[PDB]
Amino acid sequence: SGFRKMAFPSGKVEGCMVQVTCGTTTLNGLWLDDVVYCPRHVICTSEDMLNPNYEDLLIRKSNHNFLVQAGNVQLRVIGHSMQNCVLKLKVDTANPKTPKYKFVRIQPGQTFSVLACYNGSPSGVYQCAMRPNFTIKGSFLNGSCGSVGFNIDYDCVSFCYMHHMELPTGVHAGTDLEGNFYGPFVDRQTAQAAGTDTTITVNVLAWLYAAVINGDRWFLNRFTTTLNDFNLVAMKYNYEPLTQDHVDILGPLSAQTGIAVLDMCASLKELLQNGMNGRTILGSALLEDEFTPFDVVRQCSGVTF
Amino acid sequence: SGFRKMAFPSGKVEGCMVQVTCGTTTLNGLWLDDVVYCPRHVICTSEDMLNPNYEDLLIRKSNHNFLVQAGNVQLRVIGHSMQNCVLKLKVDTANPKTPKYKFVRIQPGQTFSVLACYNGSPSGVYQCAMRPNFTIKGSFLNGSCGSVGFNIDYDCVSFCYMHHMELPTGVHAGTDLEGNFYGPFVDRQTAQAAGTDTTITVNVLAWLYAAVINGDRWFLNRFTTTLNDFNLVAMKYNYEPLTQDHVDILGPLSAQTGIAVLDMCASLKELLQNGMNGRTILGSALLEDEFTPFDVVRQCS
Numbered sequence: 034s035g036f037r038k039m040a041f042p043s044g045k046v047e048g049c050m051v052q053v054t055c056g057t058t059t060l061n062g063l064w065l066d067d068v069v070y071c072p073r074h075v076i077c078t079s080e081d082m083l084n085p086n087y088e089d090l091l092i093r094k095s096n097h098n099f100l101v102q103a104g105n106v107q108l109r110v111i112g113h114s115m116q117n118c119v120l121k122l123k124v125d126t127a128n129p130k131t132p133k134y135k136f137v138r139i140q141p142g143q144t145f146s147v148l149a150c151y152n153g154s155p156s157g158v159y160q161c162a163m164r165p166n167f168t169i170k171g172s173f174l175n176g177s178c179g180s181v182g183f184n185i186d187y188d189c190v191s192f193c194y195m196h197h198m199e200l201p202t203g204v205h206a207g208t209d210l211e212g213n214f215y216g217p218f219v220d221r222q223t224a225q226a227a228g229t230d231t232t233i234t235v236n237v238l239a240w241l242y243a244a245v246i247n248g249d250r251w252f253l254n255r256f257t258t259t260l261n262d263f264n265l266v267a268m269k270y271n272y273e274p275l276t277q278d279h280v281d282i283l284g285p286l287s288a289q290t291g292i293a294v295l296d297m298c299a300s301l302k303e304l305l306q307n308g309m310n311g312r313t314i315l316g317s318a319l320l321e322d323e324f325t326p327f328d329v330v331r332q333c334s335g336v337t338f
Numbered sequence: 339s340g341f342r343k344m345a346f347p348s349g350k351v352e353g354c355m356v357q358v359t360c361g362t363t364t365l366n367g368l369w370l371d372d373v374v375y376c377p378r379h380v381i382c383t384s385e386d387m388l389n390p391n392y393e394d395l396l397i398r399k400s401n402h403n404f405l406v407q408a409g410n411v412q413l414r415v416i417g418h419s420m421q422n423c424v425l426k427l428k429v430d431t432a433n434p435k436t437p438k439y440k441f442v443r444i445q446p447g448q449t450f451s452v453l454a455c456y457n458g459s460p461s462g463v464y465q466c467a468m469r470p471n472f473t474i475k476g477s478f479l480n481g482s483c484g485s486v487g488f489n490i491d492y493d494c495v496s497f498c499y500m501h502h503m504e505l506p507t508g509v510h511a512g513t514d515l516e517g518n519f520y521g522p523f524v525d526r527q528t529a530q531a532a533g534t535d536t537t538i539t540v541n542v543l544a545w546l547y548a549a550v551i552n553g554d555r556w557f558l559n560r561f562t563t564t565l566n567d568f569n570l571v572a573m574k575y576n577y578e579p580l581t582q583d584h585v586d587i588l589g590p591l592s593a594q595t596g597i598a599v600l601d602m603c604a605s606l607k608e609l610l611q612n613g614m615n616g617r618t619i620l621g622s623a624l625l626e627d628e629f630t631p632f633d634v635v636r637q638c639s
């Protein structure tokens with residue numbers, strides 16, 4: 034027992050991290066088979082970044098302007114293309130450490146592990162959630178661009194995030210592995226403002242189910258509710274409404290505790306419309322919203338990869 | 339910018355995790371060169387664990403009683419010994435993935451990454467601190483024993499922890515890689531209580547510095563205090579004393595933020611006296627003590 038923020042083990046992603054340099058600009062890339070994926074702004078100088086034209090800057094670049102390195106070992110670039118905000122660089126060597134993988138585009142509320150990297154080189158791993166306003170409350174310094182976020186689905190790595198920028202509020206924004214931004218953000222040296230953020234309701238429920246599993250269940254009331262009524266009340270508290278997928282993924286925790294999704298919702302509706310008194314849940318007066326239902330089962334059940 | 343509980347990348351340790359079976363008990367071992375390290379209680383039955391005499395249990399075993407598994411491949415055990423609570427299994431194959439490594443014993447207040455494993459397979463990685471009462475607040479189920487804790491410096495893995503026990507309070511106990519327990523615990527099947535746990539003051543200060551670096555200044559004041567006066571109040575609330583060494587190690591965070599360590603001590607004393615009045619610091623409702631000054635420097639410079 035115990036309940037921690039746990040990242041997936043990072044080894045399969047570590048064997049895929051490379052350095053990509055165009056002139057003086059160095060950032061991180063992901064080497065899967067004979068392609069390296071990285072942020073397209075590697076082709077910019079400091080001054081270009083202000084308001085770049087990426088088609089115009091790329092047309093002037095050839096394979097031989099790109100330095101890809103695995104540690105201090107050069108991989109020759111034999112092709113390049115831009116796909117949205119990502120650059121794909123074909124290289125002469127198939128990565129012998131390529132895991133089984135997919136490119137996934139995640140929903141707000143979903144968590145993933147970030148492998149923070151500097152000059153190709155993994156530095157740290159932590160667990161994040163995609164916020165409802167399409168930011169992540171990450172930890173990133175200069176040189177971190179192209180660090181990836183991922184889930185592991187047994188032997189399969191699912192890549193969901195590539196890091197591109199820090200908003201003025203110190204939160205972070207990036208793309209899926211096809212170079213489409215999460216949220217309305219653009220890759221430009223421009224101060225961009227995120228939407229007002231909300232609490233991830235499905236994740237708070239998952240945490241409530243985790244408490245109940247650990248025999249802390251004082252907050253169970255005798256009520257139920259409709260999904261719609263709950264969704265209308267939850268939006269008044271700055272809480273994300275629930276989808277049919279949200280109800281479905283709470284299924285296993287519902288089955289294991291014997292508590293219907295809509296009874297737990299009615300319990301959480303009373304928590305918002307009342308507060309905690311000064312009482313605690315899993316030792317906390319703050320409701321945690323960065324554990325998914327899968328995060329609660331994976332960790333309470335010891336799932337491996 | 340931003341601040342997160344961050345673990346070391348796990349890859350160099352994942353390459354060393356193996357499954358160890360003796361009779362009906364399976365747990366994790368650490369395969370470095372031609373040795374597999376694992377908890378010794380794997381030689382025990384549901385009888386033995388109640389009051390095991392491990393010298394006796396071990397002399398009654400041979401190599402063939404130990405089934406080591408690295409992926410799909412069984413490893414041949416060509417010898418065995420015991421160093422305190424850790425079993426050493428000599429095998430006929432050296433681990434090609436053996437990183438540069440040391441065995442260190444860490445001090446209370448120091449942090450490390452844990453790679454939680456089940457049946458020799460990695461499940462999860464998280465950051466922990468050795469509590470002053472030599473417990474850790476981990477996340478560990480049945481099968482987790484032999485999971486290791488570690489720091490990485492350059493290409494050197496410093497192993498500092500192997501997992502053995504859950505206490506009734508739901509915290510965790512285990513050994514260094516020489517098989518000496520952190521704290522007054524024993525690898526027996528019994529309820530064991532720990533000493534009263536103190537808060538790691540130097541770590542709470544580092545985290546307040548992290549908070550200020552991330553633009554979070556509400557708890558600051560224009561009071562100051564002596565070190566002794568701060569320590570009188572800290573000790574009253576079951577916080578560890580702050581030493582001059584601790585003050586010195588906060589230096590770089592004081593210099594970065596332009597807040598003198600004793601001015602941050604004055605902030606912490608007000609927080610201990612008044613509480614946080616429903617407010618949060620870096621998204622926490624409680625004073626966090628599992629980040630070292632170095633953890634803060636590493637992430638905030």
Ligand SMILES: *[C@@H](C[N+](=O)[O-])[C@H](C[C@@H]1CCNC1=O)NC(=O)[C@H](CC(C)C)NC(=O)c1cc2c(OC)cccc2[nH]1
Binds near residue numbers: 222225
């Ligand atoms: C990666 C770039 N690289 O390594 O090549 C960084 C990661 C940032 C830096 C600090 N913390 C992080 O997460 N990306 C950037 O610096 C990014 C580059 C653009 C995509 C071209 N810019 C920003 O993240 C940025 C720019 C501004 C700004 O413009 C003057 C004002 C306010 C905030 C801001 N953030």
Ligand SMILES: *[C@@H](C[N+](=O)[O-])[C@H](C[C@H]1CCNC1=O)NC(=O)[C@H](CC(C)C)NC(=O)c1cc2c(OC)cccc2[nH]1
Binds near residue numbers: 526
């Ligand atoms: C690992 C064993 N393995 O083969 O994997 C176990 C660690 C898990 C258990 C669930 N949570 C964890 O961290 N270790 C044990 O189960 C350990 C075995 C002895 C050292 C031989 N025992 C305990 O952790 C234990 C026993 C106990 C007790 O005895 C009657 C009463 C209250 C709490 C207890 N915890």
